[PDB]
Amino acid sequence: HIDLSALNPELVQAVQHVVIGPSSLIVHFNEVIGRGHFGCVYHGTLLDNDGKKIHCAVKSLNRITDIGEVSQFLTEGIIMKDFSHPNVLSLLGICLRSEGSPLVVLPYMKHGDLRNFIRNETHNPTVKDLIGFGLQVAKGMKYLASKKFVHRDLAARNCMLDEKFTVKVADFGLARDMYDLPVKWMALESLQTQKFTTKSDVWSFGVLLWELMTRGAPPYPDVNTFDITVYLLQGRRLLQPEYCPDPLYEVMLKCWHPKAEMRPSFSELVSRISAIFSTFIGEHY
Ligand SMILES: CN1CCC(COc2cnc(-c3cccc(Cn4nc(-c5cccc(C#N)c5)ccc4=O)c3)nc2)CC1
């Protein structure tokens, strides 16, 4: 139980456009589609204002206990609503129950996370398809970066893939969670200082590209998490994947430049990757 009434009228009124009524949402607690640390993702059914059934994903957030966490939850709801972009996940809304825990209502992503999609043997993406997925991620990050938003957790498992094989940058705001660590996707300066910028997201994006070109191989499998900073300070980097073209491996290496100023912007990455994308032939997705 959490008291909706005695929160903060000015804040609560600012949230109203994000709020969903509990009557207007069905959550299928029997059908789990994802596991995080802060909560699981379920199949839900939303009813929009004209009364049409929309198939959605619903994340619970157990641990959102005190008024601080509940207030911060609403603010993240506000932030997410103001983002609109084809390669960025959108928030449908939030549902504060009378008795139960708060619920994050999200669009259903038919083909799940990008890492599990590429890892699955049933799926057969071409080299062009994989470059295309990376290009889509870059466009989302270009949008977020233009809104002065730092992700801090960009990785292939944290991007989702919809019915039309459109990649959505996900795992931010209310959808932030450890899904089923991030040290191996962190920029060298972030490992030492714990300070995150758009240029640290560029590093992480580089590793995400390596994930795509390996079809979801775990990075640095033989390097222990504690000595990763030392590995990178010796200049050691992820090797070129078997079916990764040279010009795209050059892109990855530029993302892993130790000085952050010298890394490309996401704007630059969209240009460079779309140029590389325009030399390949043949797409399954
Ligand atoms: C075989 N399998 C049957 C079920 C099918 C449908 O599954 C779906 C799973 N998840 C969603 C969903 C949509 C929007 C937002 C979120 C929350 N969120 N989750 C993840 C996430 C989910 C599951 C596993 C992993 C990992 N590792 C990561 C990452 C970022 C993020 O923001 C989830 N939609 C559908 C897929 C095929």
Q: Which two tokens stand for residue 107?
A: 């669009």
Other C-beta atoms lying within 10 Å of the C-beta of residue 185: 25
Contacts of 76 (CB under 8 A, 6+ apart): 173, 174
Contacts of 24 (CB under 8 A, 6+ apart): 46, 47
Cβ distance 203 to 153 under 8 Å? no
Contacts of 193 (CB under 8 A, 6+ apart): none
Cβ distance 158 to 117 under 8 Å? no
Query: Residue 222 carries which side chain, given as an amino acid letter?
Result: D
In the annotation, is 113 catalytic? no
Contacts of 150 (CB under 8 A, 6+ apart): 196, 197, 198, 200, 201
Do strands 93-95 and 167-169 pair parallel, antiparallel, or not at all (unpaired)? unpaired
Element (H, E) at 83: none
Q: Which two tokens stand for residue 145?
A: 């970066």
Residue of 64, 99, 10 lying closest to 176 (CA atoms): 64
Q: Which two tokens stand for residue 261?
A: 């100023």
- Rounded CA-CA distance 83/63 in Å is 26
- Rounded CA-CA distance 114/132 in Å is 12
Cβ distance 113 to 154 under 8 Å? no
Bind-site residues: 33-41, 59
Query: Residue 35 carries which side chain, given as an amino acid letter?
Result: R
> At 43, is the secondary structure helix, strand, or coil?
strand
Element (H, E) at 54: strand 53-60
Catalytic member of 3, 48, 113, 153: 153
Helices and strands of the chain, counted as H and E runs: 9, 7
Q: Which two tokens stand for residue 190?
A: 């972030």
- The domain ranges of the chain are 9-107, 112-278
Other C-beta atoms lying within 10 Å of the C-beta of residue 145: 19
Residue of 20, 242, 255, 265 lying closest to 130 (CA atoms): 242
* Whether domain 112-278 has CATH 1.10.510.10: yes
254-277 as b/e, with b when 16 or more CB fall inside 10 Å? bbbbeebeebbbbeebbebbeebe
CB within 6 Å of ligand 1 — which residues? 33-34, 41, 57, 59, 89, 106-109, 112-113, 115-116, 157-158, 160, 170-171, 175, 179-180
Q: Residue 47: is it exposed, middle or buried by C-beta count within 10 angstroms (0-12/13-18/19+)?
A: middle
Cβ distance 140 to 88 under 8 Å? yes
Cβ distance 34 to 170 under 8 Å? no
Ligand 1 atom closest to Cα of 176? Answer: 32
- Bridge partners of 58? 42, 105
Using the Cα atoms of residue 204, residue 207, residue 212 and residue 213 in order, give the sign of their dihedral: positive
Please choose from 104, 167, 179 the residue to mutate so as to test ligand 1's pocket, defined by most ligand atoms within 8 A of CB. Answer: 179
CATH T-level assignment (fold) for domain 9-107: Phosphorylase Kinase; domain 1 (3.30.200)
Structure-determination technique: X-ray
Query: Residue 221 carries which side chain, given as an amino acid letter?
Result: P
Q: Which two tokens stand for residue 260?
A: 């952050």
Q: Tell me how far the alpha carbon of residue 45 is from its chain's centroid.
A: 22
Angle at 244 between CA 196 and CA 133, to 5 degrees: 60
Angle at 110 between CA 215 and CA 220, to 5 degrees: 25
The resolution of the experimental structure, rounded to one decimal in Å, is 2.3
Phi/psi of residue 16, nearest 5 degrees: -45, -40
Cβ distance 107 to 57 under 8 Å? yes
